Amino acid sequence: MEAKAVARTIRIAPRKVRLVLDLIRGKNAAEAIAILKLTNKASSPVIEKVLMSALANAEHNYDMNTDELVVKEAYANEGPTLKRFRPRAQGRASAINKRTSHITIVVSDGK
Amino acid sequence: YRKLGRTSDQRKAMLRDLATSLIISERIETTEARAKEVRSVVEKLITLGKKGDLASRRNAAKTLRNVEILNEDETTQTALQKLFGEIAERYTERQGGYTRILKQGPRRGDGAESVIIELV
Amino acid sequence: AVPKRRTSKTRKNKRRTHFKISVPGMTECPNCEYKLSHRVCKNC
Amino acid sequence: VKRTYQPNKRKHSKVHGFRKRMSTKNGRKVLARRRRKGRKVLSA
RNA sequence: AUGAUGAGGUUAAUAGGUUCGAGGUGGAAGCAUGGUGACAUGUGGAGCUGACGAAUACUAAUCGAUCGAAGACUUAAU
RNA sequence: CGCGAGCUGGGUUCAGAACGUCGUGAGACAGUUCGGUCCCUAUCCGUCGUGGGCGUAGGAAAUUUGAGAGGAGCUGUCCUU
RNA sequence: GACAAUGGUAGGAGAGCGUUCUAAGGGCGUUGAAGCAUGAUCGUAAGGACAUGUGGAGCGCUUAGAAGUGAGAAUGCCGGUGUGAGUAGCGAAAGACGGGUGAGAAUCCCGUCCACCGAUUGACUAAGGUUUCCAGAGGAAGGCUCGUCCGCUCUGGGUUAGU
RNA sequence: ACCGAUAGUGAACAGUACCGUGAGGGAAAGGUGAAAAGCACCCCGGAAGGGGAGUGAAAUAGAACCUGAAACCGUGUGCU
RNA sequence: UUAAGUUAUUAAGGGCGCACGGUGGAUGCCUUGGCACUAGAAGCCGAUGAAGGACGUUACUAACGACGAUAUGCUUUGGG
Ligand SMILES: CC[C@H]1OC(=O)[C@@](C)(F)C(=O)[C@H](C)[C@@H](O[C@@H]2O[C@H](C)C[C@H](N(C)C)[C@H]2O)[C@](C)(OC)C[C@@H](C)C(=O)[C@H](C)[C@H]2N(CCCCn3cc(-c4cccc(N)c4)nn3)C(=O)O[C@]12C
Ligand SMILES: [K+]
Ligand SMILES: [Mg+2]
Ligand SMILES: [Mg+2]
Ligand SMILES: [Mg+2]
Ligand SMILES: [Mg+2]
Ligand SMILES: [Mg+2]
Ligand SMILES: [Mg+2]
Ligand SMILES: [Mg+2]
Ligand SMILES: [Mg+2]
Ligand SMILES: [Mg+2]
Ligand SMILES: [Mg+2]
Ligand SMILES: [Mg+2]
Ligand SMILES: [Mg+2]
Ligand SMILES: [Mg+2]
Ligand SMILES: [Mg+2]
Ligand SMILES: [Mg+2]
Ligand SMILES: [Mg+2]
Ligand SMILES: [Mg+2]
Ligand SMILES: [Mg+2]
Ligand SMILES: [Mg+2]
Ligand SMILES: [Mg+2]
Ligand SMILES: [Mg+2]
Ligand SMILES: [Mg+2]
Ligand SMILES: [Mg+2]
Ligand SMILES: [Mg+2]
Ligand SMILES: [Mg+2]
Ligand SMILES: [Mg+2]
Ligand SMILES: [Mg+2]
Ligand SMILES: [Mg+2]
Ligand SMILES: [Mg+2]
Ligand SMILES: [Mg+2]
Ligand SMILES: [Mg+2]
Ligand SMILES: [Mg+2]
Ligand SMILES: [Mg+2]
Ligand SMILES: [Mg+2]
Ligand SMILES: [Mg+2]
Ligand SMILES: [Mg+2]
Ligand SMILES: [Mg+2]
Ligand SMILES: [Mg+2]
Numbered sequence: 001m002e003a004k005a006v007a008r009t010i011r012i013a014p015r016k017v018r019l020v021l022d023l024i025r026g027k028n029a030a031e032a033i034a035i036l037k038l039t040n041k042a043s044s045p046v047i048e049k050v051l052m053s054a055l056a057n058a059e060h061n062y063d064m065n066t067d068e069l070v071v072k073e074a075y076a077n078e079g080p081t082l083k084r085f086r087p088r089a090q091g092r093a094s095a096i097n098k099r100t101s102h103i104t105i106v107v108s109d110g111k
Numbered sequence: 112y113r114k115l116g117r118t119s120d121q122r123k124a125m126l127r128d129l130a131t132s133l134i135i136s137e138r139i140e141t142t143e144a145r146a147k148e149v150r151s152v153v154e155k156l157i158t159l160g161k162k163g164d165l166a167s168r169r170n171a172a173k174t175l176r177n178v179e180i181l182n183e184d185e186t187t188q189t190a191l192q193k194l195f196g197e198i199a200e201r202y203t204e205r206q207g208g209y210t211r212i213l214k215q216g217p218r219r220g221d222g223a224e225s226v227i228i229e230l231v
Numbered sequence: 232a233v234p235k236r237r238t239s240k241t242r243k244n245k246r247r248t249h250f251k252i253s254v255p256g257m258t259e260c261p262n263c264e265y266k267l268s269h270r271v272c273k274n275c
Numbered sequence: 276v277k278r279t280y281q282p283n284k285r286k287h288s289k290v291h292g293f294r295k296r297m298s299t300k301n302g303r304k305v306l307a308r309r310r311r312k313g314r315k316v317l318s319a
Numbered sequence: 320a321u322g323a324u325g326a327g328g329u330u331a332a333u334a335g336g337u338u339c340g341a342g343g344u345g346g347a348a349g350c351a352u353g354g355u356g357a358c359a360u361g362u363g364g365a366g367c368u369g370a371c372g373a374a375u376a377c378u379a380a381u382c383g384a385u386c387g388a389a390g391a392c393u394u395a396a397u
Numbered sequence: 398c399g400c401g402a403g404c405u406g407g408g409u410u411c412a413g414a415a416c417g418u419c420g421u422g423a424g425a426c427a428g429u430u431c432g433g434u435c436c437c438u439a440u441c442c443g444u445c446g447u448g449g450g451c452g453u454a455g456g457a458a459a460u461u462u463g464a465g466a467g468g469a470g471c472u473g474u475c476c477u478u
Numbered sequence: 479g480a481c482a483a484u485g486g487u488a489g490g491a492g493a494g495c496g497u498u499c500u501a502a503g504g505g506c507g508u509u510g511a512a513g514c515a516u517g518a519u520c521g522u523a524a525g526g527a528c529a530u531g532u533g534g535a536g537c538g539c540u541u542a543g544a545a546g547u548g549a550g551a552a553u554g555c556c557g558g559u560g561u562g563a564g565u566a567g568c569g570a571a572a573g574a575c576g577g578g579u580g581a582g583a584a585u586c587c588c589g590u591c592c593a594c595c596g597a598u599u600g601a602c603u604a605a606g607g608u609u610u611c612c613a614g615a616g617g618a619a620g621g622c623u624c625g626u627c628c629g630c631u632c633u634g635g636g637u638u639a640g641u
Numbered sequence: 642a643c644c645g646a647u648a649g650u651g652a653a654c655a656g657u658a659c660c661g662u663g664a665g666g667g668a669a670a671g672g673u674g675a676a677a678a679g680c681a682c683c684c685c686g687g688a689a690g691g692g693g694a695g696u697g698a699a700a701u702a703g704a705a706c707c708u709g710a711a712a713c714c715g716u717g718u719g720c721u
Numbered sequence: 722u723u724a725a726g727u728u729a730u731u732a733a734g735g736g737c738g739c740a741c742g743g744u745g746g747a748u749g750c751c752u753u754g755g756c757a758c759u760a761g762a763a764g765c766c767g768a769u770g771a772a773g774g775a776c777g778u779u780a781c782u783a784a785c786g787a788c789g790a791u792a793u794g795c796u797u798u799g800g801g
């Protein structure tokens with residue numbers, strides 16, 4: 001079947017998460033794990049935990065093969081934005097958006 | 112030669128510190144560029160230690176730090192004494208190449224390439 | 232000094248064509264999962 | 276550089292405090308206005 | 320600048336080290352001698368020496384992975 | 398009167414002050430004099446460099462023709478005749 | 479039936495569409511109202527239906543009445559979200575290594591070495607602030623990075639005068 | 642034949658928060674469900690957050706909780 | 722085989738349509754709060770210490786309401 005995991009309101013901007021997500025989309029689970037382990041980006045361990053959670057869902061809840069799984073879907077949606085301000089010169093305040101992400105991973109055996 | 116993002120005095124001091132730390136601990140983890148620079152410093156020091164004469168010892172004292180090392184049981188020695196003692200004897204029959212660098216991969220804080228440099 | 236016109240979705244994504252990262256240069260560990268090429272395991 | 280507000284407990288109480296407001300008819304008018312508006316703080 | 324370009328990757332001199340040179344500096348330290356001493360002379364064109372030259376696998380260029388054709392049709396000469 | 402999102406800011410249209418002159422005056426000038434803040438992280442076209450993609454009817458390594466384009470183009474003195 | 483007329487700004491005239499509310503009449507609705515979404519539907523226009531999904535309790539139609547009755551522009555007001563852009567910046571400086579802790583360490587703790595101030599980057603009073611002080615626990619937010627740390631969060635404490 | 646949460650009081654939860662030496666100025670912010678029945682237990686994870694299993698008529702009603710438009714941000718691809 | 726000629730395949734990315742998500746809080750429904758009035762009554766208290774506050778009071782404790790060291794209340798008369 002298909003198993004899924006979601007990490008919601010991760011405090012990383014979706015632009016940055018999607019860069020790493022683009023690497024593992026469509027790949028085999030073990031290859032994706034290796035890619036995430038060896039990718040030097042802040043999103044990598046968060047995405048790795050989501051993928052591990054999806055694989056654990058597969059195995060425990062649906063008795064899936066755990067070795068024939070591919071990353072069928074991998075995407076990051078926009079979560080709520082923390083609005084912040086940075087003092088600038090002349091007594092002016094500038095907006096800072098501390099964006100969040102919803103990260104989804106779907107694994108499947110292809111059957 | 113590399114500048115290592117430091118002024119000449121700072122770079123010289125850091126290279127002395129790294130070389131003494133390597134002599135003491137025999138195996139240190141640093142960045143790639145620092146290790147590639149310090150291999151030359153440490154190996155020239157080992158050359159002086161193999162030479163062994165008084166002038167070589169004083170030339171080595173120009174570079175080494177004044178650190179003390181507690182050995183097996185409450186017996187102390189200086190890094191210079193270790194360099195002209197155990198380290199020099201270890202490499203009597205080796206003609207250069209007393210160190211090696213092993214790459215570890217990027218580290219979390221800044222993505223810098225961590226490496227191990229050790230005495231051979 | 233300032234954009235005369237806003238950048239459309241099309242132009243922005245065109246510009247981002249090359250904004251990406253590449254798969255790490257990685258090799259299977261013959262004895263000790265996967266590792267960066269020319270690096271030690273450092274964890275095995 | 277030196278700014279306009281240099282705090283001083285005594286100065287603040289003597290110029291804007293309750294007793295200074297009670298000391299004049301216009302100060303009592305201030306207190307009456309602030310009571311009418313429903314202010315939590317009537318004076319220093 | 321980064322890409323790129325070029326020299327190399329063990330069937331190897333690509334870089335570092337080592338050994339020996341070029342060039343630079345200009346006479347190391349230690350010791351001896353002379354001098355009350357500052358110093359001087361000798362050992363001795365000494366000692367030191369980034370980038371330059373050579374030799375030498377001592378150290379590092381491991382293992383490995385990825386991409387990459389199978390040659391369309393129509394008419395003419397052969 | 399090419400060129401200040403390339404520079405300067407001596408002059409000129411700024412607040413101070415003074416002279417000559419005019420005006421009762423506040424002030425003023427076919428005038429003069431000393432002093433007097435030059436902001437901007439380049440989106441598009443344009444320009445200088447430098448890469449990736451695909452095409453070029455198989456794929457590749459190297460050597461190349463040159464449609465076309467750019468560059469260059471100055472001149473003195475002396476001697477001899 | 480057969481003749482004519484029908485470009486149009488300011489502006490004049492006429493006829494209509496739709497919104498909310500009211501009265502009267504007649505209806506719909508948990509066998510699913512309003513709203514929302516999609517559709518290849520109807521009308522001369524404003525606009526009107528139907529079908530399906532979502533939704534979960536109200537709403538049409540007819541005639542008449544009354545209006546906070548129709549927005550694309552006001553450097554309009556409020557809210558949300560883009561672009562510029564992974565761009566500018568990250569606020570005067572010297573750090574290195576070992577060991578520890580931890581899910582995670584350039585950034586926390588400990589150690590050694592190095593370095594900076596020293597008519598002061600040292601020590602003590604005053605004003606001002608008002609719990610920021612201490613211990614134990616924490617890591618969502620705050621800290622221009624990180625964080626196991628903190629002047630941040632939780633819990634419990636702490637200020638003693640005849641001079 | 643008054644408003645219905647940008648309306649109606651500034652204020653449905655406030656002369657508060659915040660700003661100012663002061664007089665004074667002055668917000669934003671309503672809705673789970675009929676009933677808390679507010680998710681026992683298992684699994685990944687330090688946690689956060691999820692996937693199941695349950696409650697419920699409904700959990701894309703799970704507390705940032707009725708409906709959930711548009712801008713804006715993504716994933717897949719029929720034609721190009 | 723050659724020559725001459727014709728026309729594909731690619732999509733780094735982009736465009737249109739469609740499908741499915743996120744964000745956001747419009748819209749509809751709703752009302753705890755307002756707005757404008759009508760009728761009856763009443764309007765102003767205080768040195769017998771007012772208006773308005775400060776500080777306290779609950780077993781636990783921040784704020785608000787109530788209360789005042791008889792404190793999250795006491796007595797009494799009626800209601801319930
Ligand atoms: C140096 C920064 C200033 O730039 C300038 O002064 C110049 C060099 F950018 C400038 O003079 C520009 C060029 C001016 O525009 C010209 O105006 C002319 C009339 C016409 C001309 N064109 C159209 C022909 C225009 O281009 C004008 C009006 O600024 C006075 C622009 C307007 C928008 C203007 O007022 C702006 C806001 C002006 N200003 C007043 C400064 C007023 C003078 N000032 C104040 C300060 C200051 C204040 C606080 C702290 C510190 N440390 C310094 N420094 N200088 C600022 O606070 O900032 C700037 C940008
Ligand atoms: K000598
Ligand atoms: Mg300021
Ligand atoms: Mg360098
Ligand atoms: Mg110096
Ligand atoms: Mg001109
Ligand atoms: Mg100028
Ligand atoms: Mg110009
Ligand atoms: Mg000038
Ligand atoms: Mg006169
Ligand atoms: Mg001058
Ligand atoms: Mg030509
Ligand atoms: Mg051409
Ligand atoms: Mg000539
Ligand atoms: Mg007409
Ligand atoms: Mg006509
Ligand atoms: Mg009219
Ligand atoms: Mg009409
Ligand atoms: Mg109408
Ligand atoms: Mg309605
Ligand atoms: Mg209107
Ligand atoms: Mg507008
Ligand atoms: Mg914006
Ligand atoms: Mg942007
Ligand atoms: Mg960049
Ligand atoms: Mg830019
Ligand atoms: Mg830049
Ligand atoms: Mg920068
Ligand atoms: Mg700083
Ligand atoms: Mg000093
Ligand atoms: Mg503390
Ligand atoms: Mg942080
Ligand atoms: Mg605290
Ligand atoms: Mg609403
Ligand atoms: Mg309101
Ligand atoms: Mg749940
Ligand atoms: Mg769950
Ligand atoms: Mg569950
Ligand atoms: Mg649930
Ligand atoms: Mg729903």
Ligand SMILES: [Mg+2]
Binds near residue numbers: 709
């Ligand atoms: Mg909702």
Ligand SMILES: [Mg+2]
């Ligand atoms: Mg693509």
Ligand SMILES: [Mg+2]
């Ligand atoms: Mg949407």
Ligand SMILES: [Mg+2]
Binds near residue numbers: 779793
């Ligand atoms: Mg109580």
Ligand SMILES: [Zn+2]
Binds near residue numbers: 263264275
């Ligand atoms: Zn390994």
